[PDB]
Amino acid sequence: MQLNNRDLKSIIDNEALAYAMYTVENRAIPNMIDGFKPVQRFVIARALDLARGNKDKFHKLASIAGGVADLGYHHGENSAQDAGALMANTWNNNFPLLDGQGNFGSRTVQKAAASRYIFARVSKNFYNVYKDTEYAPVHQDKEHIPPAFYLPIIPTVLLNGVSGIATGYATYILPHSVSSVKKAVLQALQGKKVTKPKVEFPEFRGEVVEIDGQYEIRGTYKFTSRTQMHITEIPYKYDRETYVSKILDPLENKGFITWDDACGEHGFGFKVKFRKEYSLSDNEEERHAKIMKDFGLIERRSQNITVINEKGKLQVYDNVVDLIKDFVEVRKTYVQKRIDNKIKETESAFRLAFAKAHFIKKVISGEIVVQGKTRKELTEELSKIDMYSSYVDKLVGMNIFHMTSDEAKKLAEEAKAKKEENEYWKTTDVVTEYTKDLEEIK
């Protein structure tokens, strides 16, 4: 029974501030490099773990989103289910990082089916653009099994399009086409005028025009003969439920239109015929303005590019070009880390291979006799001699069937051929290898 007087300003200074920062950094705002909120990196880490044995196996969403608490997820698994279900589809994804089978939703029904059914796996796009997954930064916490953030080749944050809300700060980035983000990254790599990426929406046939920051995602209509029109595409904001009841229902039970459904597999098809009570005129401009205003064929979006940079701190960008220019420079210092790590690893591997070849070539002849020995004397005799102690575990690793023919040839071939890899890693630069890695995205 303890009595402590806690001033309210201390509560707001510690607990409220900590929760606000936690929502800002670890809940809503995505990473600039990786492109994932700190729930989608959990989902992808678990799904890529599940694909260790079989790469093409489809695993249930209750198995991918389930059991992420051992990776460090401190929240309920239903949030992981709804977050991994939204990133496996194609109606809202310009570059899906999960390929799934089942009802993941469509543009008409922007709601995935229950997690009891739908299966998902890591898509080939992830394997095509997410390289150096073993060189990714390590998080401070020991319980955070996934790395601090993965290391894609192009900025994924601009591709799929994100929208997050946190206390104090919120982010909203529109989707950008892959073929333009790739061009921008390639231009930034060599050093040139970075052409801005073009905003493109998934499964959308309209016209995304930008005037100044604002975007003017449009639709399409077509007068059949004189009064009948065919809305061939509604803006990207709209479902089918919240377009019949939002613009099409409050235009029929008013004495304006009579509409039918022709939403074929192409997309949205709400055929509409106007009755006598309408104010449409022969002027094309006024008719166009009234049609695109009343039917809600124009939506307006403005990006708010707020991302968590490589330092873990929030950052707001004015345009996507700056984001690409900074991301290229951040990834160019990780390509160099890949070069250094590969050089060291190949040197360490060739030394072991050469030691193994030496042991096979000097034991078969009959110099290092192992007959009638024990563990300790062999491990001491091989450690006292040079070139062998640093890999003294190598004594038993090659197994009996290497003390034959057709193995000394192979054992020496590995040592001879690892110098090709080492020399290749000792001459390639960051720009050359990055350019080579960027040509495999198709």
């Binding site: 089978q101 089942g102 009802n103 939703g105 469509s106 008409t108 029904v109 709601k111 089916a113 229950a114 009891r116 059914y117 739908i118 299966f119 089918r240 039918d260 459904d261 022709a262 939403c263 074929g264 597999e265 098809g269």
Partner: protein, 284 residues
């Protein structure tokens, strides 16, 4: 004005419109894209249907997915859904050899299609006058060459094709419960107006072509007769299929349900208060 009812364009008019009662919102997500927009409907139910055998027509209209189905289809409990026309004239069609006795206003089958006999009267074909009192109801009803013309009906959808999951729960608990509910109008199971949309419960990947098994029992009759099968078990109708849904909707295999003479006994034994009849029915 049902919230989840996906209306057809021709719903309420004189057309071969169809309703597509599922057993969940998940199974109906892909229907709105792949269905025929002129003659196809849809209403997702909510789990197992209420056992409505023996209840009066005041507790049936208390479950959500027993009043919604009644209002959407336009059926009203305790009233005849159809209204047949006169049955004076008689004629013969002579299709595939068997003598089909038809009336002046009937509906024959042509490879699974419905065409009125009255319009067929324009061309001679094989129409042969025959005397009255030739009531061969079962003779022409075995493959349904005769459907009495409906003088008037309050039915919005002139088809109640039921599609649910092909698992045991969705095939032996929601299938016969809905059959017993629609049994309140013993005329739907007389013109093939209640249909079962068969759903694959297992899709194997033998060779490069996908093999479809509609029931688990059917699958466990060629399992050790099939080469290198890597099957997928479908638990949910619309949530384990991506383009198989489109094929199964645009190329469906219906089963029209027909009531035998002693349908009441079967329904009472399966859906009844006496649990001892089921112990003597499952033991044989």
């Amino acid at each position: 004005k049902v919230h989840k009812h996906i209306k057809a364009n021709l719903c309420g008019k004189d057309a071969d419109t169809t309703l597509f009662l599922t057993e969940g919102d998940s199974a109906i997500g892909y229907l709105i894209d792949v269905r025929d927009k002129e003659l196809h409907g849809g209403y997702p139910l909510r789990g197992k249907v209420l056992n409505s055998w023996g209840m009066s027509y005041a507790d049936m209209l208390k479950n959500k997915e027993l009043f919604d189905i009644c209002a959407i289809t336009g059926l009203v409990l305790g009233e005849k859904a159809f209204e047949e026309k006169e049955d004076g004239e008689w004629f013969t069609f002579e299709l595939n050899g068997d003598t089909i006795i038809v009336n002046e206003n009937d509906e024959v089958q042509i490879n699974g299609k419905w065409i009125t006999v009255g319009e067929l009267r324009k061309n001679l074909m094989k129409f042969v006058k025959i005397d009255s009192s030739s009531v061969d109801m079962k003779k022409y009803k075995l493959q349904n060459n005769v459907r009495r013309s409906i003088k008037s009906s309050s039915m919005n959808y002139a088809n109640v094709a039921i599609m649910t999951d092909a698992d045991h729960d969705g095939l032996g608990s929601i299938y016969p419960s809905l059959l017993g509910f629609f049994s309140n109008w013993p005329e739907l199971f007389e013109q093939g107006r209640i249909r079962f949309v068969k759903t694959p419960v297992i899709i194997a990947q033998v060779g490069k072509k996908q093999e479809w098994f509609y029931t688990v029992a059917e699958y466990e009759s060629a399992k050790d007769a099939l080469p290198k099968h890597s099957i997928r078990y479908i638990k949910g109708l619309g949530s384990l299929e991506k383009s198989e849904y489109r094929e199964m909707i645009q190329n469906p295999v219906y089963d029209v349900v027909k009531l035998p003479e002693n349908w009441k006994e079967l329904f009472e034994m399966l859906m009844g208060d006496n649990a001892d009849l089921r112990k003597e029915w499952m033991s044989q």
